Amino acid sequence: GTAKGHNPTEFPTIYDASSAPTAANTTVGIITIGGVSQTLQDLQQFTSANGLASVNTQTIQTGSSNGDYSDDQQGQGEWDLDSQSIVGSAGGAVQQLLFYMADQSASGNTGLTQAFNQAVSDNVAKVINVSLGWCEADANADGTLQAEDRIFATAAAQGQTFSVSSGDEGVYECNNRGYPDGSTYSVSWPASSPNVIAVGGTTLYTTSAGAYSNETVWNEGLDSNGKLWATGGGYSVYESKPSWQSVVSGTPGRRLLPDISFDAAQGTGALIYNYGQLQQIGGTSLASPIFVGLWARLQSANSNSLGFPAASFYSAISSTPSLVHDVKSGNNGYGGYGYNAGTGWDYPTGWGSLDIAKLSAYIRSNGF
Ligand SMILES: [Ca+2]
């Protein structure tokens, strides 16, 4: 297998989803900070280049009608990554793509919170992508965690799936966002929520012909600033373990994360149009939208009748190892520190990545 960049349109064949329907009958959401004007141009570039049918989009101002929904330039890169990866992974079509735009003028974390809130209150997107986060402890300190979890709980109860990136700072989320801190480990919010699916990151290897070859932990070491780039993983210091997680024995009574993982290494990352320019981008910010696109196909396959799938993932995969690619090699730390991947569920990658056709069949026979 080879480490290389990938067009989003290749993820269905890498993760075994070509024989499933596209997401044409499922509506998908994406949370952003600020506007997406350039993003929408970039998205036009993407569908046209790949010869795809255009995507029906909507943009929503989730807060004050006088708030700041101007484009954030660095932001467009994320929303680019998110939207192109979702649509590629979905097999090239979604019913509609909604951009839930957070007000940039709002106080504290209130803009983001209202954006989560509008997606939930409208209840039209079945799956919503969240490619962002920060130190859960900071979120806890100022009341943001409590506020946002109420909203995710409502989502789960109404059958909506929020997908959240686990982080890109490995075990060192709360140390200046990724600076090595020896044996001191932390995690990112909102991934640590039990009411969302947390998606970690892999190093993705492919055959010459482009088939799946294997996956190791995402960990590309330190940048020139001294910051670690690797998959977020561990357990929450605040959130209690949901009981479906009890099948992972020998772990504390806390929410363990991530749940599942997909491609995240920049070296094996996605090729994305940004301000008209193709760039090779990675992170758990990529793995999450790959899951969202794949999961949107299974909804389309099941008349969008699949509720919040955490409990089901844990029971099905623990009893059916063929449903996933089990990551077994690497760590999400530095200098000897960090968690190591291993047989079955582990802290850097969770259950690993999903084999979609096999999951599809399982659901055929057993429901989800
Ligand atoms: Ca494993």
Domain ranges of the chain: 1-368
CA of 349 to the centre of ligand 1 (A): 7
| Cis check: omega of the bond before 309, within 30 degrees of 0 | no
Residue 138 in marked binding region: no
Q: For residues 162, 24, 159 and 11, what is the CA-based torsion angle, rounded to 10 degrees?
A: -40
Count of other CB atoms within 10 angstroms of residue 5: 18
Distance 57 CA to ligand 1 centre (A): 37
Residue 48 phi, psi dihedral angles, 5° rounding: -65, -45
Compute how many other C-beta atoms are within 10 angstroms of the C-beta atom of residue 278: 14
* Sequential DSSP letters for 81-130: HHHHHHHHHTTS-EEEEEEEEE-SSSSTTHHHHHHHHHHHHH---SEEEE
91 is in an annotated binding site: no
223 among annotated binding-site residues: no
Distance (Å) from CA 347 to ligand 1 centroid = 8
Give the residue from 293, 193, 178, 182 showing the smallest Cα distance to 240: 193
Whether 215 is a known active-site residue: answer: no
DSSP class of residue 56 equals P
User: Count of CB atoms within 10 A of residue 9's CB?
Assistant: 20
Start-end of H helices in the chain: 11-14, 37-49, 73-89, 110-122, 136-141, 144-157, 284-301, 310-319, 356-366
Give the closest residue to 202 by CA, choosing from 131, 132, 288, 128.
288
Residue 257 tokens, joined: 């994360």
Q: Which residue has the tokens 């509506």?
A: 27
Give me the resolution in angstroms, 1 decimal: 2.0
> How many Å lie between the centroid of ligand 1 and the Cα of residue 344?
4
Residues paired with 230 in a beta bridge: 169, 219
How far apart are alpha carbons 197 and 191 in whole angstroms? 7
- Between the CA of 101 and the centroid of ligand 1 the distance, in Å, is 36
* Tokens of residue 296, six digits: 């949107």
Q: Which residues does the chain break after (C to N > 2.5 Å)?
A: none
Pair 166, 199: CB distance under 8 Å: yes
Taking the C-alpha atoms of residue 345 and residue 200, their distance in angstroms, rounded to an integer, is: 12
Q: Is the dihedral of CA 221, 258, 212, 47 positive or negative?
A: negative
Q: Tell me whether residue 344 is annotated as binding.
A: yes
Assigned token pair, 115: 């954006």
Is 327 annotated among the ligand-binding residues? yes
> Which is catalytic among the residues 16, 42, 78, 239?
78
Q: 345 C-alpha vs ligand 1 centroid, how far in Å?
A: 5
Omega before 258 within 30 of 0, i.e. cis: yes
CA distance 266 to 160: 30
Instruction: Report phi then psi at 197, rounded to 5.
Output: -95, 125
Q: Which amino acid is at 262?
A: F
Q: Which two tokens stand for residue 144?
A: 């943001």
Cα of 247 vs centre of ligand 1, distance in Å, is 14
CATH class of 1-368: alpha beta
CA–centroid distance, residue 75 to ligand 1 (Å): 33
Q: Measure the N-to-C terminal CA separation of the chain; round to a whole number of Å.
A: 33
Q: Of 80, 82, 259, 355, which residue is the catalytic one?
A: 82
Catalytic residue among 166, 285, 312, 360: 285
| Residue 285 known to be catalytic | yes
Query: What is the residue whose two structure tokens read 């995969």?
Result: 317
